[PDB]
Amino acid sequence: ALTQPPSASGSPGQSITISCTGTSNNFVSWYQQHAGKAPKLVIYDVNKRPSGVPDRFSGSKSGNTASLTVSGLQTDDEAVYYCGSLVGNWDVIFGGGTKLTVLGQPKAAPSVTLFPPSSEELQANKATLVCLISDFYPGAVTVAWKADSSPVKAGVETTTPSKQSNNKYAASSYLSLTPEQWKSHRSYSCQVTHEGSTVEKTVAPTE
Amino acid sequence: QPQLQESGPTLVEASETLSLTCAVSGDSTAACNSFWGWVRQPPGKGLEWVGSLSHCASYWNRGWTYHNPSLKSRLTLALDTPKNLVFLKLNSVTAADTATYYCARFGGEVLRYTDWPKPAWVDLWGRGTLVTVSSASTKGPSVFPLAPSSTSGGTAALGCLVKDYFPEPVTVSWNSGALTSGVHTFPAVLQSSGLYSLSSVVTVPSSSLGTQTYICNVNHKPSNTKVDKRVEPKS
Ligand SMILES: OC[C@H]1O[C@H](O[C@@H]2[C@@H](OC[C@H]3O[C@H](OC[C@H]4O[C@H](O)[C@@H](O)[C@@H](O[C@H]5O[C@H](CO)[C@@H](O)[C@H](O)[C@@H]5O[C@H]5O[C@H](CO)[C@@H](O)[C@H](O)[C@@H]5O[C@H]5O[C@H](CO)[C@@H](O)[C@H](O)[C@@H]5O)[C@@H]4O)[C@@H](O)[C@@H](O)[C@@H]3O)O[C@H](CO)[C@@H](O)[C@@H]2O)[C@@H](O)[C@@H](O)[C@@H]1O
């Protein structure tokens, strides 16, 4: 599989490189996807540009690592970038995508509020933990959940960050549990990773 | 420049068949320069290759058809070159098939090749069509309070959990629109049950929790439902 970092950022006019490991051949491509729009091919065959793609986009490859470089970032370059490749005889796979932010305001750490299941929802025989994340920039976070100290993967739904009225970003994440498993642990935690920082909030049924 | 335009149903019940048509303009599906196929993208996730095909035969076949191995047992691709149409058929859909489906033209070592053509990259994308897999019927939401504590430096977050409605959209206001500052309503999540949920949150001064009433107003026009839910501090 192809591995991309979740996000990267630079200021207008700077140069930035994002990488993609696992490319074992020269059938490498890169795609630009603006929010709400279809992807667009910007690099093919490691370093070829389709007609109309500015020369400030350039591709390269070293070992099993392909790289896309954008010289002189413009605000229009803000998008999610995917690497693609041929694998096996004739299969196509894509990387997980890198959210590239062109910095237009100070970076801001997120505020995290973790709501336990409401009494009303528990009386309807359901239990949902609500982790609300707000006031961060760039608009890219990783959310992980823990029961006591053990990581939890099943029952998690997370929204893509969307802009607030103050133009910072917010996101939400949900952990769906039965009332029994909510009562059976000592605590639950929502961990939000943003840039080089992780914020964790904890709730307990005995609160 | 060439254009790809998808069409077909955007709501498919679970276990049923998902069928999509793509109309190609400005290029020939009968020419041998490209493969034609599909890429999909679940909401909020990455790109996933579906497959592609070509009707340009070698001397030992009638064409080429490549499938994503995890979809092959359910997947059928087709071309109608006189009408310049690309087809997708996917049986027994589950929630994991909810995605934006993109019609796609593939390039690579296609016109000339050794051993077999290698369509490796998508050089032309359709606009995409979001197909939702859900057996749900129209259903109004259940609204639950996200109560504040009697939270962080003089201000308190509180909100509403809008659960298990169908279809979209739901709109949320606070205090019949009298409270807008510090309000944020989040995008909906499609749960594995086939129903949507979202949350709305507002930050207010903690000193107001005892004197000011906070009510979220949830409007679900598809079911002609409105819900006002009083959000009161925890006890
Ligand atoms: O990237 C795909 C796959 O690659 C790796 O897995 C290996 C792969 O090996 C396939 C095969 O390759 C080599 O043979 C090459 C070809 O030689 C001959 O011309 C002929 O035998 C070919 O057979 C095809 O054609 C005949 C007649 O035309 C058909 O009757 C027959 O069913 C074959 O048809 C398939 O292949 C053609 C292209 O060759 C397609 O156009 C056609 O639509 C059909 O494709 C379907 O089935 C494929 C599986 O066979 C599948 O990949 C497609 O997506 C589609 O569903 C012959 O192909 C030799 O090395 C030979 O020994 C190999 O078997 O597939 C094997 C099974 O998966 C696997 O064991 C090999 O290791 C892996 O990377 C894998 O993960 C990846 O998906």
Numbering used by the authors:
A (entry chain L): 3 to 9, 11 to 27, 30 to 95, 95A, 96 to 106, 106A, 107 to 210
B (entry chain H): 1 to 35, 35A, 35B, 36 to 52, 52A, 52B, 52C, 52D, ...
Q: What is written in the article reporting this PDB entry?
A:
Among the specificities that perhaps have garnered the greatest interest are bnAbs targeting a conserved patch of oligomannose-type glycans on the gp120 outer domain of the HIV-1 envelope spike (Env). PGT128 and related antibodies bind conserved glycans within the oligomannose patch on HIV-1 and exhibit broad neutralizing activity, and thus are of significance to vaccine design efforts. We focused on incorporating a D3-arm-like extension because the D3 arm, along with the D1 arm, are known to be important for the interaction of PGT128 and related bnAbs with oligomannose. Here we demonstrate the design and synthesis of a series of related mimetics of oligomannose based on a bacterial oligosaccharide template and show that a single prime plus boost immunization with one of these mimetics, in the form of a glycoconjugate, evokes antibodies that can neutralize a subset of HIV strains.
From the results above it was clear that neoglycosides with the 1-6-linked D3-arm extension were reasonable mimics of oligomannose. NIT68A was chosen because it bound PGT128 somewhat better than NIT68B. The structures are notably similar in the equivalent portions of the ligands and in the Fab backbone conformation. Superimposition of the putative common ligand moieties gives a root mean squared deviation (RMSD) for all atoms of 0.22 Å (0.20 Å for the D3-like arm alone), emphasizing the strong resemblance between the oligomannose mimetic and Man9 in the context of PGT128 binding. In addition, remarkable conservation of hydrogen bonds observed in PGT128 binding to NIT68A further supports the antigenic mimicry of mammalian oligomannose by NIT68A. We then synthesized two mannopentaosides (NIT59A and NIT59B) equivalent to the Rv3 oligosaccharide backbone and a set of four mannoheptaosides (NIT68A, NIT68B, NIT70A, and NIT70B) that incorporate D3-arm-like extensions. We found that none of the soluble glycosides inhibited antibody binding to NIT82B as efficiently as the NIT82B conjugate itself, suggesting that the antibodies, as IgG, are interacting bivalently with the glycosides on NIT82B.
